[PDB]
Design a binder for this molecule. Structure first.
Ligand SMILES: *CCC1=C(C)C(=O)N[C@H]1Cc1[nH]c(/C=C2\N=C(C[C@H]3NC(=O)C(CC)=C3C)C(C)=C2CCC(=O)O)c(CCC(=O)O)c1C
Ligand SMILES: C=CC1=C(C)[C@@H](Cc2[nH]c(/C=C3N=C(/C=C4\NC(=O)[C@H](C)[C@H]4CC)C(C)=C\3CCC(=O)O)c(CCC(=O)O)c2C)NC1=O
Ligand SMILES: C=CC1=C(C)[C@@H](Cc2[nH]c(/C=C3N=C(/C=C4\NC(=O)[C@H](C)[C@H]4CC)C(C)=C\3CCC(=O)O)c(CCC(=O)O)c2C)NC1=O
Ligand SMILES: C=CC1=C(C)[C@@H](Cc2[nH]c(/C=C3N=C(/C=C4\NC(=O)[C@H](C)[C@H]4CC)C(C)=C\3CCC(=O)O)c(CCC(=O)O)c2C)NC1=O
Ligand SMILES: C=CC1=C(C)[C@@H](Cc2[nH]c(/C=C3N=C(/C=C4\NC(=O)[C@H](C)[C@H]4CC)C(C)=C\3CCC(=O)O)c(CCC(=O)O)c2C)NC1=O
Ligand SMILES: C=CC1=C(C)[C@@H](Cc2[nH]c(/C=C3N=C(/C=C4\NC(=O)[C@H](C)[C@H]4CC)C(C)=C\3CCC(=O)O)c(CCC(=O)O)c2C)NC1=O
Ligand SMILES: C=CC1=C(C)[C@@H](Cc2[nH]c(/C=C3N=C(/C=C4\NC(=O)[C@H](C)[C@H]4CC)C(C)=C\3CCC(=O)O)c(CCC(=O)O)c2C)NC1=O
Ligand SMILES: C=CC1=C(C)[C@@H](Cc2[nH]c(/C=C3N=C(/C=C4\NC(=O)[C@H](C)[C@H]4CC)C(C)=C\3CCC(=O)O)c(CCC(=O)O)c2C)NC1=O
Ligand SMILES: C=CC1=C(C)[C@@H](Cc2[nH]c(/C=C3N=C(/C=C4\NC(=O)[C@H](C)[C@H]4CC)C(C)=C\3CCC(=O)O)c(CCC(=O)O)c2C)NC1=O
Ligand SMILES: C=CC1=C(C)[C@@H](Cc2[nH]c(/C=C3N=C(/C=C4\NC(=O)[C@H](C)[C@H]4CC)C(C)=C\3CCC(=O)O)c(CCC(=O)O)c2C)NC1=O
Ligand SMILES: C=CC1=C(C)[C@@H](Cc2[nH]c(/C=C3N=C(/C=C4\NC(=O)[C@H](C)[C@H]4CC)C(C)=C\3CCC(=O)O)c(CCC(=O)O)c2C)NC1=O
Ligand SMILES: C=CC1=C(C)[C@@H](Cc2[nH]c(/C=C3N=C(/C=C4\NC(=O)[C@H](C)[C@H]4CC)C(C)=C\3CCC(=O)O)c(CCC(=O)O)c2C)NC1=O
Ligand SMILES: CCC1=C(C)[C@@H](CC2=N/C(=C\c3[nH]c(C[C@@H]4NC(=O)C(C)=C4CC)c(C)c3CCC(=O)O)C(CCC(=O)O)=C2C)NC1=O
Lengths: 177, 164, 172, 233, 59, 331, 177, 164
């Protein structure tokens, strides 16, 4: 559970020296880019219901055998555990957007998830598909290009940060497969 | 999956005893009320089609705002999901009616429903409109036996009181 | 395996759509970038031995733990393993620089690298320091204007840097 | 032009040839909004009442009212120019400006010349002649197939709900004209006549929110060929 | 599939009696319930119970 | 058994009997009766001893505690503490094991999750070393964990499988290594027993294992251990790696297959009945066409790492040698 | 109202520079293919009533809840307004095919349509389905591949232009949603 | 009641230490974002009545079937309970807006809501219609400071995502 600060400090601790100029310079760029990351996490957190709803409903509509009897989602409870899992995945992604390093997401939720879903019977492909829909919708909300919510912020460039969020989602989707 | 025999076997199992005469009296009552339950199951498997058809038709006869816009169903697909969900419900009423406890109806239909109806913007009052139409529709001593009618009404009431 | 092109085709078949005109424009764009890309890959493949050697010298100079008896790079065998691992990392970053996608680098090398270096007793962060050194030397080598036509190559160095940063992120 | 709501729901036009008193009164309410004129103001407008009891030039009646201090006082003296131009559209034409160009045209005809040239400019519009002529009291028209969709949105939003009275309210179309964003769906919804199912759009819910049309959002489109799907962007 | 390509039955050439037209249900309320499913109108008629099987396999 | 039937995966994972719940709903004192309390008391032994056997004579140990549970003295939190401190619980779980195994058992008995990370181990080992056994056991019970999940009137249950405890995916899989379904007691399974510390390399490094459901063949794997290379010198023979790096990925994604029961009688090379090398009985494989006395499979339980295009063939080879498949995990 | 010419001029206006070479080169490609654009608009116009008939009849037959009591096609006046709107939509798409730029379609009809159909209670699912039917029928007429009419034209590839008309219909259907 | 200072005090208290410089930086950020929060609180306490009036009017503009028969809002009293409930909600948005965490909004409005709106046959989608109307209809430049509008929209979004 380490962000960008802890990463620089631990690497400079194994190197065994003082923090130094270059490391501090890159970390200055992080803090100067701070408020964009703030507003970004605000966007993904204040669209949690839509992101989870649309994502899992799109997972069902793409592959309609999940809802057919015998699928993972056929049981009513199964659908509730399905929605919970989508919500939790979105939640740790939002934590990795704050921290700037994926240490929280890797050590918490990504570790052993594949073998859990294997052991329970969950199809990996459907989940990978749901994570990809959360990716596209979440980057569309983080770039204010959502097709039904257009909030006002001052205009600027946040391509870097979009690539960052897409890197966390690709980490999850590659982690379940 | 709760039934008479699973409650008593699970209860004596939690005790740590072999099954005494008490469990035997319980399963004796199972095989007493059995004929009325299975009669209701026979007639439900007889006309499930027309039951679900009258259920959904009366459900949109009450609430027309369902097709008003995004809320509820405004397309043929969503209405297909509507009649499919009522198919599932009557099928679980058939299953719990065979088992004779509310077990498969609870674990398959009721358990964790609230997150699903809540999250997917599904109003429960329209479900209740469907079931209260079918509850009223059956006529005492016009088709099934009077106790079978009681059995069916009881199970359907359980659905309603578990829904909202 | 996935190459820009393979990834876009593979997704487009995983949905079973054709490629839109938008996608085709993007493809054409990356191709027009592609000579410069091959130029960066050429630079790295050339001076690779000096990258690994010098970066190992700076690793052992900044941390003289590993060269001492009982340290992890202390044996002829273990030293050779150490150098060769650095050559592995630099090899796959050269691969992913060619492909334009970071898939080969993940699937062959980085995905599960930490599990190994846990499993062997190797200090992970020391590997990360070594990959930071290969990043420094490799970028400073990539931005050399020696022998090459001028122009702008900021985006490709950005990308390259992203690959090395992903390597040091995956060991730590 | 089907004109779905023209005669089915909205009341008929007050033509001249019936009784004069009903024409006079209905023109008070239309030209004014629900002004609720009192004894003094009606005595002050007596000569226009005379001119229109005599000849039924309701066009000249509306001209004569808008030139009078009772109309000038409220709207041209309590009220700011933005809202003045917009209300002028509503009182005379029944409709809102359809674009920023036309609003600039009316403002320009004001600033070059004065008040009376502006009033004669509304009253002498060819659009005004085709809608109303010399003989029909102004009213809100439900044409269908309007020139702009924004014309419909702004027109209905500025044709208030029954019991209007713009004397309380503040100007809702200034940012709307200059920006090109159409008004809130609620105000549009409040102003529609009865039986139009007011605002049963607004799909809101866990799924399908889509509450605000967003200009910047990228455009996607899928068709089905026997092989599979072509997405055109 | 059964589609005739070049084909017109005139139904004006027939004798005056022998054009008979029948409606399955002569009502408004029962041809369309408030909900979408229908046994007469639309594509919804495809989803009636029964008729899933076929008796032309006897040839 | 399985996943799909019954629409519930977790019954068939072996957690079938752990869903039942016990709470004392009776307030005040129980006089005359002693049915309900003896049921709850029995569930306390079933939870804290984890289905270990207590003899009638033994029941005389902890009889004071037992006669204080029935009275208003101990909430079941504190009775569970009293069962935990006594000589029994020391003999079984504390004295037999190294300090680390003891910790993991104490979580299986008291909290019903596994430890997920090394630090949980840091906390409990630290408390033991500073203050001793009673403060160790208090350090389990005297925490916000037990109080929050159980509320002091409810007997502990296995919750490590459950989503509600945040835990770790690792702690979910580790959860199924520690609980093997109804019959297996504390020392019933291998991987616990007396001298074993159960999962150490796994629990310390949060290596998520895999789940083999109990039963349906291949119920036991007990996979062989690995060493660490030239430093901390190791034998490289015994197990396939959990990782599979590059150069062999080509040809499909890599799957780790664990085959469970391998034996000479079972191993036939595809054709039924045991092969006889000499005319009369010499059943081991001839090495250089000279008789050897080395078994064909040398440890039971060897693993296979196999890429996708080679799966089918490997899937056949296992069943040629009559080995049974424990689990297959994509890696 | 801007055609392709005005789009090139307005874009060159921002940089305050002359038309130059490349923009005029693309506009030369516009002029050369003008006959194909001419005959394309002739194809979409000379079948237009029949396109609107088939599309709205298909919209009702796909979703028979519209003609059900309570639906927005349930009355004659509602049905008239329905056919009227489909005719208008195809009219402005035809204008966008003559212009070559969707400025006319954005300024006339698309701007403030979602708010209008929100205000009137019109269903989004029905609106976008009918647009999609007009899209497929219209491109089928524009490639001369209609199953009912095959009119004689000089042969030639017209992929670009059909993709353009499909882009305008996708702009309308994306606009109402 | 969650805020910055209650989270850091409760966190250091769960640690067992004095508050170090990290908690001091957290409450430093509290007193940085403070002015925008209190500005939004001032304007909300300014025109709460017109906000709740537009909220309920749009909520019954969107939904009309509430007014007829069994469904809530049919009588004047139930609709008075409707605008009273939205009064409570904007008052909790004001409270969480002053506190700056979602604490009072969570414990007073959100905690245990689902049993209540589920049991009393209250649809949550109508509440979401009210809040999404008050969310869509505001201009940051015109009636609030830029930071304040963000804060208000954030709080209101929390309400929506906690509701359904
Ligand atoms: C309510 C959340 C929401 C708002 C508000 C909005 O404007 N749109 C959504 C989020 C959103 N979703 C996408 C992208 C896709 N969404 C889906 C799921 C739907 N598609 C289906 O076929 C079905 C079942 C019928 C559902 C539920 C899909 C498949 C995509 C595209 C995936 C891809 O690979 O691109 C987007 C981005 C597109 C856009 O609207 O601009 C957004 C913002
Ligand atoms: C406590 C919570 C909290 C927040 C949520 C933010 C919100 C916020 N963002 C900005 C400011 C900003 N926010 C963005 C972000 C954006 N860039 C874009 O391309 C997108 C539209 C969007 C990311 C999704 C940008 C670009 C600025 C600077 C705007 C400018 O100066 O033009 C500012 C003004 C001060 C500043 O410049 O940093 C504030 C208060 N700040 C806070 O204190
Ligand atoms: C901290 C991170 C974290 C996670 C990522 C989840 C992962 C997770 N999911 C489930 C459990 C579950 N997860 C799903 C989800 C699925 N339904 C499907 O149709 C799809 C295949 C898939 C969604 C994409 C389902 C249905 C269950 C219940 C399975 C069952 O009981 O049969 C469980 C077991 C406990 C439970 O029942 O909740 C766990 C640990 N939990 C966590 O604590
Ligand atoms: C075993 C029991 C069992 C059930 C009872 C159902 C319950 C259920 N319904 C839906 C899903 C759905 N259910 C409906 C039904 C409705 N349409 C409306 O207009 C009405 C309010 C309502 C009928 C009365 C609709 C429309 C959906 C799809 C919702 C959507 O995707 O927007 C889903 C999510 C998966 C899916 O999309 O199918 C589930 C679990 N499923 C089950 O497995
Ligand atoms: C599986 C369960 C199950 C039921 C509960 C019934 C419910 C039911 N009843 C009827 C149909 C009917 N039900 C009644 C009964 C009534 N006569 C009255 O005077 C009273 C109001 C009421 C008895 C209390 C009548 C009269 C009809 C025929 C109605 C008609 O044709 O007008 C129909 C339509 C098909 C038919 O005509 O039979 C159905 C589905 N059917 C089932 O399959
Ligand atoms: C296809 C990709 C691929 C890789 C990336 C490597 C990764 C890798 N390295 C080692 C193994 C090793 N790797 C190192 C390397 C290190 N020495 C140190 O001082 C540093 C921390 C670090 C270099 C930066 C060492 C020393 C060993 C041997 C460890 C030991 O035996 O103690 C092993 C185990 C097998 C072996 O002993 O060779 C593997 C799989 N192998 C591959 O097949
Ligand atoms: C088979 C091997 C092979 C190569 C090694 C390259 C070498 C190469 N590079 C360029 C061309 C180029 N190469 C670069 C690269 C540079 N940008 C800078 O800032 C640095 C000095 C340098 C990277 C280190 C640039 C910028 C161009 C374009 C030059 C220009 O058009 O001004 C060209 C001309 C064709 C083109 O434009 O692509 C060629 C042949 N091509 C090949 O086929
Ligand atoms: C701007 C200057 C100006 C005027 C001077 C008047 C002149 C005038 N008077 C009347 C109209 C009238 N004027 C009178 C007045 C008369 N009653 C009698 O007994 C006397 C002969 C006489 C007063 C001395 C009457 C009675 C009518 C109505 C005539 C009728 O309707 O029969 C009309 C027709 C419109 C109307 O009915 O009001 C007009 C234009 N109007 C003007 O706008
Ligand atoms: C210049 C561009 C331009 C448009 C695009 C239209 C848009 C439009 N449509 C309507 C009005 C209408 N539009 C429709 C159409 C529909 N019927 C349905 O079943 C479908 C959902 C949908 C066709 C796909 C209907 C039915 C009405 C009347 C609604 C009513 O009165 O209930 C109105 C209100 C005025 C009227 O009643 O005509 C307007 C402005 N008008 C314009 O001036
Ligand atoms: C005033 C109205 C008006 C029209 C409607 C057009 C109609 C038209 N098209 C062409 C001519 C042409 N039109 C097309 C168009 C086609 N390419 C194909 O692949 C499709 C079948 C089709 C588009 C849908 C082509 C390709 C030619 C040139 C044919 C040739 O030279 O072979 C010509 C001959 C003169 C010329 O070469 O331009 C004319 C009169 N011209 C007009 O003045
Ligand atoms: C502190 C926060 C707080 C709230 C948010 C409310 C929430 C709330 N509302 C009601 C109760 C109610 N709330 C409504 C409101 C509704 N009428 C409708 O038509 C709409 C669906 C909806 C308005 C949008 C109605 C009608 C009742 C009474 C329900 C009934 O008795 O049938 C009750 C039960 C007690 C009572 O009767 O008042 C509660 C707790 N109360 C609180 O203390
Ligand atoms: C405490 C918080 C708080 C808010 C956030 C506002 C929100 C708000 N705005 C308005 C009201 C209004 N708000 C706007 C604003 C808009 N003009 C446009 O062109 C844009 C779409 C938008 C700015 C971005 C307008 C124009 C009105 C008046 C609408 C009208 O009367 O037509 C009203 C009704 C009362 C009034 O007329 O003032 C309210 C409650 N009020 C509050 O008390
Ligand atoms: C039962 C409810 C119902 C309808 C109504 C139709 C409506 C309909 N027409 C289509 C498509 C369609 N429609 C026409 C126009 C049409 N055909 C002609 O030859 C002439 C002269 C026409 C006007 C009179 C054409 C030319 C096509 C393209 C397919 C073709 O080649 O015929 C398509 C295919 C859409 C797509 O490709 O995505 C549909 C759904 N379908 C239904 O299910």
């Amino acid at each position: 559970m380490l962000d960008a600060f802890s990463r620089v400090v631990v690497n400079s601790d194994s190197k065994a020296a003082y923090v130094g100029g270059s490391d501090l310079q890159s970390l200055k760029t992080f803090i100067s880019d701070g408020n964009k990351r703030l507003d970004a996490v605000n966007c993904i957190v204040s669209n949690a219901s839509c992101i989870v709803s649309d994502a899992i409903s799109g997972m069902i509509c793409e592959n309609p055998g999940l809802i057919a009897p015998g699928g993972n989602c056929y049981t009513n409870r199964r659908m509730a555990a399905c929605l919970r899992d989508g919500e939790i995945i979105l939640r740790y992604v939002s934590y990795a957007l704050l921290a700037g390093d994926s240490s929280v997401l890797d050590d918490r939720c990504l570790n052993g998830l594949k073998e859990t879903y294997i052991a329970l019977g969950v199809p990996t492909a459907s989940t990978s598909r749901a994570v990809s829909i959360m990716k596209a919708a979440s980057t569309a909300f983080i770039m204010n290009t959502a097709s039904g919510r257009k909030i006002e912020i001052a205009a600027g460039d946040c391509q870097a940060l979009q690539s960052e969020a897409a890197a966390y989602f690709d980490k999850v989707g590659s982690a379940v497969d | 999956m709760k039934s008479v025999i699973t409650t008593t076997i699970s209860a004596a199992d939690a005790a740590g005893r072999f099954p005494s005469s008490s469990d035997l009296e319980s399963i004796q009552g199972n095989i007493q009320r059995a004929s009325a339950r299975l009669e209701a199951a026979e007639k439900l498997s007889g006309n499930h089609e027309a039951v679900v058809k009258e259920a959904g038709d009366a459900c949109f006869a009450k609430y027309s705002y369902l097709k008003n816009s995004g809320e509820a169903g405004d397309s043929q697909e969503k209405i297909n999901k509507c009649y499919r969900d009522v198919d599932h419900y009557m099928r679980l009423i058939n299953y719990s009616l065979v088992v004779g406890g509310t077990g498969p109806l609870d674990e398959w239909g009721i358990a964790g429903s609230r997150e699903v109806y809540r999250t997917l913007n599904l109003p429960g009052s329209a479900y209740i409109a469907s079931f209260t139409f079918t509850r009223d529709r059956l006529c005492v001593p016009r088709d099934m036996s009077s106790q079978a009618g009681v059995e069916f009404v009881a199970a359907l009431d359980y659905v309603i009181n578990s829904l909202s | 395996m996935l190459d820009a092109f393979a990834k876009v085709v593979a997704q487009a078949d995983a949905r079973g759509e054709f490629l839109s005109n938008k996608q085709l424009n993007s493809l054409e764009t990356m191709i027009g970038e592609g000579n410069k890309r091959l130029d960066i890959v050429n630079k790295i493949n050339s001076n690779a031995s000096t990258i690994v050697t010098n970066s190992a010298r700076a690793l052992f100079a900044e941390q003289p733990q590993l060269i001492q008896p009982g340290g992890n790079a202390y044996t002829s065998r273990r030293m050779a393993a150490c150098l060769r691992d650095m050559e592995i990392v630099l090899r796959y970053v050269s691969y992913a620089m060619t492909a334009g996608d970071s898939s080969v680098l993940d699937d062959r090398c980085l995905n599960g690298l930490r599990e190994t270096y846990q499993a062997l007793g190797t200090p992970g962060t020391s590997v990360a320091v070594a990959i930071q050194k290969m990043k420094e030397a490799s970028i400073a080598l990539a931005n050399d204007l020696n022998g090459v036509p001028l122009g702008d190559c900021s985006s490709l160095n950005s990308e390259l840097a992203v690959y090395f940063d992903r390597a040091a992120a995956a060991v730590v | 032009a089907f004109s779905s709501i023209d005669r089915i729901l909205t009341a008929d036009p007050v033509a001249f040839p019936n009784g004069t008193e009903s024409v006079i009164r209905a023109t008070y309410i239309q030209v004014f909004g629900n002004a609720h004129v009192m004894d003094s103001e009606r005595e002050e407008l007596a000569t226009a009442e005379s001119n229109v009891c005599r000849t039924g030039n309701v066009r000249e009646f509306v001209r004569a009212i808008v030139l009078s201090e009772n109309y000038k006082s409220r709207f041209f003296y309590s009220v700011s120019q933005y809202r003045f131009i917009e209300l002028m559209f509503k009182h005379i034409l029944g409709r809102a400006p359809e674009s920023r160009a036309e609003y600039a045209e009316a403002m320009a005809v004001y600033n070059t010349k004065g008040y009376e040239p502006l009033v004669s400019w509304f009253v002498d519009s060819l659009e005004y002649n085709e809608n109303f002529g010399s003989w029909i009291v102004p009213y809100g028209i439900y044409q269908g197939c309007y020139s702009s969709n924004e014309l419909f949105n702004r027109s209905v939003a500025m044709r208030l709900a029954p019991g209007c009275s713009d004397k309380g309210r503040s100007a809702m179309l200034q940012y709307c004209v200059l920006s090109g964003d159409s008004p809130n769906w609620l105000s549009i919804s409040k102003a529609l006549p009865a039986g139009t199912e007011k605002g049963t759009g607004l799909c809101i819910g866990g799924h399908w929110q889509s509450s605000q049309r967003n200009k910047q959002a990228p455009v996607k489109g899928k068709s089905k060929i026997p092989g599979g799907v072509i997405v055109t962007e | 599939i059964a589609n005739p390509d070049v084909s017109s039955v005139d139904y004006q050439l027939m004798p005056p009696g022998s054009v008979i037209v029948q409606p399955d249900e002569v009502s408004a309320a029962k041809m369309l319930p408030v909900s979408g499913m229908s046994k007469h109108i639309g594509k919804t008629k495809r989803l009636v119970e029964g008729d899933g099987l076929s008796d032309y396999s006897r040839l | 058994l399985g996943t799909v039937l019954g629409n519930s995966s977790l019954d068939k994972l072996g957690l079938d009997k752990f869903v039942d719940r016990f709470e004392v709903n009776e307030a005040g004192r129980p006089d005359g009766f002693s049915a309900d309390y003896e049921v709850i008391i029995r569930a306390c032994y079933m939870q804290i001893f984890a289905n270990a056997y207590i003899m009638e004579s033994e029941r005389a140990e902890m009889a004071k505690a037992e006669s204080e549970f029935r009275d208003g003295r101990f909430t079941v939190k504190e009775f569970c503490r009293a069962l935990a401190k006594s000589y029994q619980y020391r003999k079984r779980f504390f004295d037999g094991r190294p300090l680390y195994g003891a910790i993991e058992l104490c979580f299986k008995h008291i909290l019903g999750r596994t430890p997920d990370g090394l630090e949980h181990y840091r906390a409990k080992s630290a408390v033991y070393d500073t203050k001793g056994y009673e403060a160790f056991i208090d350090a389990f019970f005297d925490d916000g964990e037990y109080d929050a999940f159980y509320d002091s009137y409810c007997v502990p249950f296995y919750r490590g499988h459950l989503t509600t405890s945040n835990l770790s995916m690792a702690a979910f899989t580790h959860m199924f290594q520690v609980v093997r379904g109804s019959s297996t007691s504390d020392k019933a399974n291998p991987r616990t027993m007396t001298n074993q510390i159960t999962l150490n390399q796994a629990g310390i490094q949060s290596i998520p294992l895999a789940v083999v459901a109990p039963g349906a063949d291949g119920a036991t794997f007990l996979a062989p251990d690995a060493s660490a290379g030239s430093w901390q010198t190791g034998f490289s023979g015994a197990t396939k790696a959990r990782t599979s790096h590059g150069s062999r990925q080509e040809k499909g994604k890599m799957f780790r297959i664990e085959v469970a029961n391998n034996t000479q009688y079972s191993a036939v090379g595809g054709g039924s009945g045991i092969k006889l090398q000499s005319r009369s009985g010499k059943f081991y494989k001839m090495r250089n066409m000279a008789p050897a006395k080395v078994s064909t499979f040398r440890r039971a339980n060897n693993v296979y790492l196999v890429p996708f295009d080679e799966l089918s063939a490997t899937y056949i080879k296992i069943h040629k040698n009559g080995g049974s498949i424990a689990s297959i995990t994509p890696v």
